[PDB]
Structure formats: C-alpha cells, structure tokens
C-alpha cells in the first residue's frame, strides 16, 4: 500500500503492484508518516497512473519509480517518454523563485 | 540571398514556447531645468536598477523642436524623444513625430529643371533646412499653371514659409512647379513605407494633439505616442527611467537602422 | 478468427434463441451447429493470458450435447444450456482479449495467441457457422484479396493538428496575412486572415489556400461545407512561429469568395465545387484542396470604411474561413469513428491490464499517432484487434 | 466512485475513458511572458482592464456504453415515449417529471426511474418493431 | 514578405535557368584640372551611355583631397567607384578610407565624459572623423585607475591620432579607456563590422597595393573590390574606367543591406 | 498469372531436359506435365497484341502429345518435342507482350490481357506445375495473404535528387552556410559546408542534418556509411536557388564531428550508430536521418590556421560530408536494383513497340518518377508487369 | 554482468557468478557509469579471475 499526499490537499492511496486507488486511512498515513522516511512524490500518483496504463511499466520499474529512483528515472527522460518528461518539466517551470 | 522572405513559416498553435542601446532625447529647458552637472551620471546609474548596464544609456539635447527637425538623427536602438507641448506648435510637432516615427525612403527632386507629381497617398515632399520656404503651382495637361503663371513665382500658392520641416501634400497626379528656397532648403519626394518601432515619442504637457497621418478621416494612436503630465523635469525623467520596461516593450529595436539618417535615401 | 467468430455467433444465438417455451423447430439447426461446437471443442486445453495483468487461465472442455427430444424447451433445458454457454462465453472473452493485447510487426494479421493459433488449426474448421457481421465479412474478403469497405460515422481521418502558417509577417507581428487551420477527426476548420484587407493586393484580392492529405483513400463521402470557421473569429493571443513572443489577432469576418473545394486523387481533381456550400458528395478521394479568396469589398458605409484604413495601423484583421466535415464516408481500411466502439474497447483492455508497449503500436493507442504514421503493418494489427474486438462486443455487454 | 481509471495530461484530438463516473478539468492560465507591443497592449498592470484574458475547453463524448438506458442522438426510444404521453394527454405519474423532461430525468435518474425507463424503453422498441 | 527571419532557403544543382541602376564616379580635383575640358563630364556621360548606361544615370561627385573626403563619404548610388590617387606619406589614410568605404559599419554613439570603453571583439572599433580628431586614451586596470597613465590629467594620456580628419582606433579588447577626444570637432563612434559593402569599389590609381583592410596583421585580403592601376593620363584612366565598366560591375554588387529583404535585418 | 507462369516454366523445363540420349526416367514427370498442357490448351483460341504497333496474333492448339515409351530419348522424339516447344514459346512470348504494355488504373493487380483473362478460368487450372521462383512465389504469398519479401542488391529506392540548403546566405554567396546532396539509386551523399568554419558559431560547432524519407519499407538492409562525400570535395560554380546568378564553392574537408546516423520506422528510431562507419545493419526502417557536426580544430599548424580567418574574406570553406550506400535490402514492394533486368524488359518493350502512354506509369517508364509517386495503383501494376517480365525471361533470352 | 576500466587504459567485461570474460561494450559502460553507483575495483579484475 502507498498512501501520497501533497502540500495541495490532495491525497491518494494505491497499490504498488497496480496503480489502483484504495481508500485513503488518514490516521494510518499519520502513523505510517511519523516513522517511515517519506519518499519525494517526484512522478506523482497521477503520473503513475497514466504511465501505467499507457505503458505498462514493468514490476521493477514501478518500484524504483515509487521509490523516485535517479536511475529508472533518468532512464524515462532520455528514452523520451512524454509523460515523465512532462512531469519533470512541470516540476523545472513550478521552480520559479 | 533573401533570407527565404518567399517562404511560409508554419507554427503551431498549442506547443508551449514562453548590448542595446537607449538614446533620450530632451529639450534645453530640461537641462537648465535640472541644473545639475552630474544628472546624466545620476540618470545613468538608475537606469542600471531596471537593467541597461553603464554605457548603454546615452542623452541627447536639443534646443528646440525646430531645430531638432532638421535632418534629426536616430542613433540607438530604442530611441525615446520627450516633446515639449506648445500650442502654437502642434503641426510641426505632427511633422516631426511622422517624420521619426513612421520609415520613409526619399529621392533627390531637382526643382529647377522639373516638374513633380505625387503619385499615391504614400508620397509626399520633405523638406528640410534653415529655411524652407515652398510655393507649388498646379498644372494642367498643357503644362499652364492653374491660378498661377508658371514664369512668375509670385502668383504661386505658398504651402510653406521659413519652416524647419515641411511635409507637403498636394494633389496627386497633377504636376507643380515649385518655387522652393533651396539656398538653405533641400526638399526630396519621398513615400512611407512603414511605422519605425525603433523610435517613440512622449510628449509632456498638451492635450493629444498629433496627426501622423495626412489624411484628414484618421489620427491615428500608436502605442508609441505617449504623453505625460509634467511640472518637473525630475519628475518627467523619473518616470522615464522608472517606467523604461513598458516603454521598451512597446517599442522594438528590429527597425534599428544602419545609418542614423531618418529616411532611406536612393539616388 | 473465422472459428472464433463463429464460437462467438453460436453463443450469441443460443442466448438469444434457446428460450423456455421456443419450438424446437424454431432451434433445431441452432441446436445442431451447438452440438457440433461442443463435440469439436471436446478434450482440447486451451491457455489464454500471461501478458502483462492479464492472468493466465486454464480452458478444459468435457460437455454433453443439448438434447433433441423435446418438441418445446421447458426450464431444465435453458438451464443447462445457460450453464454450458457461461462457459463458453467466458473461454470467448479470455481468448479476445489475449488476442487483442498482442501484436507483431511481421504476418500482423495472423493470430498471435496460442489460443488462437490453436483454432487456426484444421479440426476446428468443422465449426464455422455464419459470417454475417461486417467486420467478420470484411475480414473474409481481405483474406481473398477482394475489395473491402467500412461504412464510418464522421471517420477519425484527420489527426489532430491546430497550426497557423504565414505568408507575410514583421518582428512586431502588426501587419500579417495568412493562414489558421484545425484539423480534427473527420472536421477541418480553416481562416485565411488579412491585416491590411487586401489594400494593396493585386485586384484586391488575396489568395488562400489549404491543403489536407488524407492518409486513406475515402470513397462515397457525405461533406457538410459551411462557409465560416467558428474557430477563428475571436480575439486571440498566439505564439509565434518560434515561441519567443506572442502576437495579437483581431478578426472580422467577410464572406469567403471564390471557394473551390476539389477532392483528388493520386493528384488527380476527382470533385471540384464552386461556391457551393451544405451537402456536398465526394466518390473517390485521398487529398482535399480549399481554395478561397479574401476580397476587399469595393463598397463600405462609413462604419466599415472606418474598420479597413490604408495606413499601417490595422485594428481589425479582415478574414475569411471555411467549415468542412465528413459526415460519414466508405473506407477500405480500418478506422476509429464517432459511431463503433472498437478502438475504446481494445485500449481499455490494454490499459486495464497494463499491456507493455509493443513494437506496433504507439503507446495508449494513441489514434493521432497511429493515422499519422498509419503503416501496413499497422494496418494489419488494427484490423485484426478490431476484428477480435467486434467478435467480443457480440458477447460481453 | 472518486477514484482516478483514467488521466491524460496535455493531450487532445481522441481519448479513450475505460471506466467512469466523473470528469475533472484542470487547465492554467499562464500570462505571456514575451509579448509584441500590440499583446502587451492590452494587458496593462492596474485595474482598466479592456479585454479579459480567457483559456478554454471542450470535451465532447463520442460514443460510450452503459449499463442504463439513456437518451442518444441515435436512438428515437425516449422521442417515442414522449410522443405517446402527449399524443394521449397521460396525466403527470408519480415517477417521470413532466412532459419526460429529460434535463429533470438525468439530473435526479433514480433507481425507480431508471426501472420504469427501461420498462418504456423496451416496449417502445417493441411497438417501433411494428409500427412505422 | 516574411520579413525578419532566415527561413532556408533551397535549390537544385541539375537545373538549367535558360540599365535600370545608377552609377557613382568619385575622383580629385586634380583629374578635372588636367582634363581642363568644361564638358568632359557630358563626354563621359556619351560614352557611358555607348557602354549602355543611359544618360542621367552616370554621377561624376568630385572631392579635393583623400584627406576630405574621407570626412563622412556618403556614397548614396546603386553603384561607387572611388578613383583614389596613390600618395606614399598616406598609407594608412588609403587604408582607412578604404576600410570605410568598403565594409559595412553598425556605430553607436560615443560620450566620452560620461563613460568609459571598451572593445568587445575583433570587429569592434572605434571610428572617429571630423575636421581635426585627436585621441588620446588612457587604459584602466580594475580599480579604474589608468596604466601608465593618470586618469585625472590628460597629458599623460597615450595618444593614437593627430589631427586626423578619419581614424579607426584599435585598442586591446576586454579592457576599460577613458579618451580625450577633441570632440568640439571631430566625432568619434563605436563601430562594428559588419561585413563587405558591395555598393562600393575604390581604384587606386598610382603606386603599389597597400591597401590593408583588416586590423588583424595577419591578414591583408585584397577582395574583388579593391583594383590598382598605373596612369600618366587622367584621360587614359577615365577612358579605361569607361571601357571596362562592364568588369567593373560584375565585380561589385547591389548593396545587400539596401534589398528590401534586409528589412529588419539593419536597413530597410 | 500461375498459369502463364506455369506454361513458361514447362517450357523451359522442357527445352532444358528433353535432349537426345537422356533416360526416359529422367523426364518422365515433365512429359507428363507436358501432355497435360497440350490436352488443356488444346481446342482454344487465343489472341493477343492491338495495342500499339504489337501486331494481332491468333493462336490455336491442335498439337499431338509426346511419346512415353522409349528408355532413352533419341533424335525423332527431340525434334517432335521442339516442334511444339517453338510455338508454345512463342504464345508465351506475345501473351507476356501483351500483359506488359497495358496498365489499369483500377485493380492493376488483374489480368489485363484477354489472353490472360481467358487463362484466368478454371478449366485452365490443371497447368500449375511449380511456383519456385522469386515472384512467383511472392505472388502467391501475397495472394495468400502471407509476408512477401524481394531481396535487392543495390535498390533503387532514392529518388533521384541534386540540391542544397542555405541556412546562412546572402546576394553575394560570399559567406554561406548549408547542406548539399545527392540522393541517386541506392547512394546518398550529403555535404555541411561553412565559410566561415565556425568561427562565430556557439562552440565552434555547426549542425548539419539530412533526412531521406523512403517510399517503402526496408527490412535487413546492410548498409556502407563512410566519413567524406567525395561528390561535394572539389571547386564548383553552382547557379543560385532562384537561377539567378551564381556562386563559387572552394571545399575544404575536414573531418564530421559527432556523426549519427538513425534508421526509423514510423517515426521511432529503430537503429542507431554513433561515429561508427564501415558495414551496419538497418533492420526495419523507412528513414535515415544523418546528424553531422563541422567542429573547428581548436589547435591549427600555421598552414591549417591561414585557411580559416575571422573576417569575411574566405577563399576555403570547411565541408564535412557522408556517403551511405544501401548494398542489400529486403522489401514489400517491387524495386529496381542493379541485379535484375525485369525494369529493363519492361520498358524495352513499351519502347520497341512504341505504346502509348497510359494513365498509371510515367512517360518512359521514368523510374525516377515512379519511386518519386510510388502510389498504390502504381506498385500493383508494376508487380503485376515485373512477374509478367520474369516469366518472359524464363523463355526469352 | 560486470563492467570494469582503469585509468592505464585496460577495460574488461565479465559476469558475477563466474568470471567469464565478455567483449566490452562502451556505449552500455557509458550509460551504467553515469546512472549506476561506481565501484572502486580494490580487487581488479585479474586478481579475481
Ligand atoms: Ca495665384
Ligand atoms: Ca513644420
Ligand atoms: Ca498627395
Ligand atoms: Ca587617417
Ligand atoms: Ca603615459
Ligand atoms: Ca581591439
Ligand atoms: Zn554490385
């Protein structure tokens, strides 16, 4: 189970075999986000889901992408996937000052 | 060759895109206004605040619009000209304004030996000097004056006296005769081509008065033409400077010219 | 395909025909042709699945034929006829969808499941039943290399594409004159624009023109031509060519004319209509040429005279647009449309078990992508996935 | 049921929605940052604001399938009902608004509505069966 | 009509493709005062007109010195060929004017009492001409003090023109100068180089080719533009320049600055 | 068309094996499949040619079968045999004639000879002996609805193309930057120039690029790619875009920096090879896309330095160049490679008999046209005419 | 699969489970030796072989 929650008072909570939402325990969130170091959402959940279902990501992949691996991470951007390169140039542009 | 001008340029719709120089130029009264030596220093140091780094930034002076409309001169790449209002003024602040405003190309008229024509509502005569004094006597299809002898100057119709700048306007695809004092005037037939984004005017006091156009149905205000409220010299550079970003992005510097003259001369 | 579509119009017509209190003279070869299938499909194992989310299933058939003793069915016959026919159904939709998730850049048409490749086999044949339904008939004549059409509502021709191209133009963007342009779907929405109406041109007049190629052959097309595009008749702020800056349209509308839309092909002018608007008819085509002029209107009352100066300054930008959309249109191909909902069923079957990209298709199947670069092999594999999906949709409500 | 099936980010011509019950739009009005003194124009820095800056959408559903029966721009089923209530002034029920107003109909398609539409609907068919 | 851009341009190497201008003949006083002949331009002008240049169209501008003229040498004709006289004391000068007349200049304006300059690169230089230009500069390290010079007295300040009517300064880029420059008569401008003008050709006529028009000392290109010849007779040179007008303007070219596809791209 | 194929190839078996002194045994099925086409050819009436100057042929078949009896073939029975033999040939010869000079707008794959036609009939069946040859089989593949594939040693699959790109450029052509190129056969040769040698360029690097979209897809296709375009390395007075006038190129080459060169399909990069030159794989691919770079030498000998100054005057322009040859290729559609002679009999014939040109095929058969406008229509004629013309070539030599 | 060079100039390819020298592939070393965390070869290639 993957619980996400964003500065933006969206929340969201899926499974990380398949990018399919669950509903979204606050109080087990709490506790999950009082101890566990907290994972940089970098390819949101939105993200994930369209990658998912338009790629078919593999198992691996999804892990390292949930754990915001450098390494499957850089692999999407040079491989050109416009989803992730999207996300990622979002994320550049929401860099203003 | 042509820089592929005969080709189309195709853009889309919905793909997301998002040193130079600064002439102003003043009237002496400011100056003596300002009293100050060092003004041009202390001008030039606010402008490095909105950005133009030292040296970019120079200050033209002079005496009055009529001298300044002799043959004026654009030197940097966005040339700002502060007019002073006066009542008694507004048709040669108009000429002045068409003149550095909109791009004109001019051919040498030699008067003595021939007679001109306007061709289109895009030509007119410039004239410029100490002082141009014009008389035009129309002609009919036999070459005789109109309500006017073509051998005496005397009976032709004066347009213009001992002015600066003159842009006359007769009527086009009569000849004329001109009478013009070209000891100290040279006049040129020239056509406008287009406006010159290189250049704008604020005018300080007055009530918007400045027709660019020669026709009479139409006064056109560019966003170029600007005018101001003034009672201090301070106050009017001040905003200047402060103001230099939305002044600059109305203008555009691709009209800088490769030679500062005010029209594209052609032998 | 032939045998699965077949398995699938025998279950279809069993759920549909054998109802309690029928005659069996009413399905009494239905019930022969279910008997058939029963007995060629008795002690074969079948495996579908194992491709992304799609679980891997196991298919056993040992099932007893449907009586024929009866001069009408009673409860117990429907009953154990429905029991046998879930089954079926089943199995069907587990083979469609495994056929469906899979494709190959060489023989594109040929089955690509082992369930499929299985039915390919010869002892299967015995059940073939009727092929009555477009797709399966198309499928057919493709097959034996005979002439093959489908019949689209508004086809899914034009790719998506919304561009603007110009023909004069400055560094401030204040005096231009060209060309806007969407095309969508089976709509093509076009606006010559003018700054200066035409002042200076030759006659008056400027030139426009817009050229779509399609990247299928349309016969007997239906075209609805209006002569306004909508689209381009408000104030807009539109990057430039490059992207640097940004540049101001201000649009008042004039008629279009001089219209003269022609429908060619391979460059050769099949229909040509002048001035002509509404319902037009298209019989053979794969490039459409619109032609339409901006004329300065030799008469204005002062309220427009007003509008069009002959000085630079250009308030308002004359222009001129048309309107053409595809009704509906016959096509030897396969294509998305507005009316069968193949294309949704194959991609929510591949997005809802998370099928890897393959090496045909763009991801998602992405319909501006696959028309865009619409390939043989492409072809073959969207024909045969749609093929399997009209098979599936005969079932699966 | 408030759960994202299906999200696509800055892609438009055809999409395919598997499965759903609710559409979010969400779309940015970004200022230019680079304008040509006739956009600059007309977007100053204080209040006169002359024209107003505006970013659309439009999003129409081609085709779809359901598991009730609805009013489409193919089918004459619900023209069919209508037709029949208003040719024999049927006095207003206690389950369809009047006159079938379909806008009532679909904003408030309860479970009971929904069973007596497809009720009329399959009859209607039926009767279309026949008559002409 | 897409001014502005540089879209590219595309043509084929396997196709066969199977008067109206005006032209500008500058020259001394002194050629006039040999020819002593009052209508020696109306006879030129005849000839032109038998090489097929019709009448009116061939100037004939006259200027005293090299020394004058190279004060602002507006050349405003389709066509200009400036026949200078050769002087072995006036290297540089030849030089220079030549420079000036043959490549194309963007300058911007020069207030040396308000600011100090610097050159930027290779083709940045500072053009100054009037009646009497002296220059005298002063480089400063990075505290703006001057090197080997005082930056509040101009005597000791290194000079690099005297009384000069036309001179290109050339100083080491990337450093800051305060100038004394003489400007109650002469003008001084920071200019670029822009490229070759092809409107203009300059003959010299006398000694050898000296010309130079590249500050870079390790280059002195003699373009198409830049021709020599010997002479006793102004008569023998102008029939010379007459006879072979057809070479001389295939060797020039419309300036491309003044094409009307250059709108946008500095004139026009 | 297998039965034309099939009347050719008895022929030829039979001029090849029944010669005198051979074992009966060793002929024994040939004469069999021999006798079979008399006894089938035998009572029809055929004609052929009227179109152009070919001449109207009729032919009838009144001819006895052949012996089976003896144990070794003597003299008699091989004069017997090659009495037959000569105006069987002969019927195959103009009936192939006759199907090569016509052409058909709609279904160009059929039979367009009445000969042809006639021996489209199923009473004709009973002469298909083999199907062992190139295009045949591949028609047979094709008819099948299975992947066809034509190996090509040098195919012709560029249109023949000569031209430039200025990106850089101005009236005097004194100081330019661009690409030239040479698409021709199965060779593209593309050349970067700059004057200036980059001197002003960000990093001293100049881009070039140079797209080449193919007609057909191209499988398997073993490829030269070399690092100079020998075409673009000399002085040449070329004459402007527009005809104008004229400008000079003084080449001097230099090495290209940072070559890569892409093969996709579809618009996706299938192959790709980074500064490699020598023998490379394209394995499916319908454009090469070659990505060059002119770096100026950051470190210059005294002699190499003089070439490249900052100002304008430049006497030598730095020119980086490729060359890629296609040696082998595996494709769909026919083509013309430097191997076979079915192009060069086709269009030999059209020409001998001077036929009119029709309303598919170019003047001449202009090959290059025909790549340039490679249409559907086209392709299937020229299949259909290139089997016409193997099955020709079988007897006529 | 492992890849390993050395400032002298001496590259090798090999795998995990037995040494089994393969042919080196520098475009793939690339890759793996921005991405991948790099190991110092304390024990090389030779003296694990
Ligand atoms: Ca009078
Ligand atoms: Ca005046
Ligand atoms: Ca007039
Ligand atoms: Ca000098
Ligand atoms: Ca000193
Ligand atoms: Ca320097
Ligand atoms: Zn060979």
Partial sequence: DVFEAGIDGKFFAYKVDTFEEIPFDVQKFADLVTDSPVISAIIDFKTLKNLNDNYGISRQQAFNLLRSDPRVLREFINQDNPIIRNRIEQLIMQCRL | ?267 | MDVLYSLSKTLKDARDKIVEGTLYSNVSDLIQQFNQMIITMNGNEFQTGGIGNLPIRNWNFNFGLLGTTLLNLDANYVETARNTIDYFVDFVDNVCMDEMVRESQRNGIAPQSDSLRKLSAIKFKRINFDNSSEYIENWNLQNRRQRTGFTFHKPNIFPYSASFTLNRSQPAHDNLMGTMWLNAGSEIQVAGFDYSCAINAPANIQQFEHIVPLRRVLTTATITLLPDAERFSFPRVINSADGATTWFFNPVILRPNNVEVEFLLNGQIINTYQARFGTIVARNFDTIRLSFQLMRPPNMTPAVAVLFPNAQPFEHHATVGLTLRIESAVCESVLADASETLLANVTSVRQEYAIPVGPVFPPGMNWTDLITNYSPSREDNLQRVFTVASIRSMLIK
């Fill in chain 2, 1 to 267: 060759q042509n820089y592929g001008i005969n080709l189309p340029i195709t853009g889309s719709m919905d793909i997301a895109y998002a040193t130079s120089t600064l002439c102003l130029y003043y009237p002496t009264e400011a100056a003596t206004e300002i009293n100050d030596n060092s003004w041009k220093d202390t001008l030039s140091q606010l402008f490095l605040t909105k950005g133009w780094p030292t040296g970019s930034v120079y200050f033209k002076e002079y005496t009055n619009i009529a001298s300044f409309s002799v043959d004026p001169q654009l030197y940097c790449d966005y040339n700002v000209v502060l007019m002073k209002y006066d009542a008694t003024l507004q048709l040669d602040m108009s000429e002045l304004a068409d003149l550095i405003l909109n791009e004109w190309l001019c051919n040498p008229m030699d008067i003595t030996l021939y007679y001109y024509q306007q061709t289109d509502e895009a030509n007119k005569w410039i004239s410029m000097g100490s002082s141009c004094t014009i008389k035009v006597c129309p002609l009919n299809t036999q070459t005789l004056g109109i309500g006017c002898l073509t051998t005496d100057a005397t009976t032709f119709e004066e347009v213009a006296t001992a002015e600066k700048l003159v842009i006359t306007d007769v009527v086009d695809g009569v000849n004329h005769k001109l009478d013009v004092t070209t000891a100290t005037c040279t006049i040129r037939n020239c056509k406008k081509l287009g406006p010159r984004e290189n250049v704008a005017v604020i005018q300080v006091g007055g009530s918007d008065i400045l027709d660019i156009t020669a026709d009479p149905t139409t006064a056109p205000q560019t966003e170029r033409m600007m005018r101001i409220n003034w009672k201090k010299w301070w106050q009017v550079f001040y905003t200047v400077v402060d103001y230099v970003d939305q002044i600059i992005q109305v203008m555009s510097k691709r009209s800088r010219s490769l030679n500062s003259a005010a029209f594209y001369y052609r032998v």
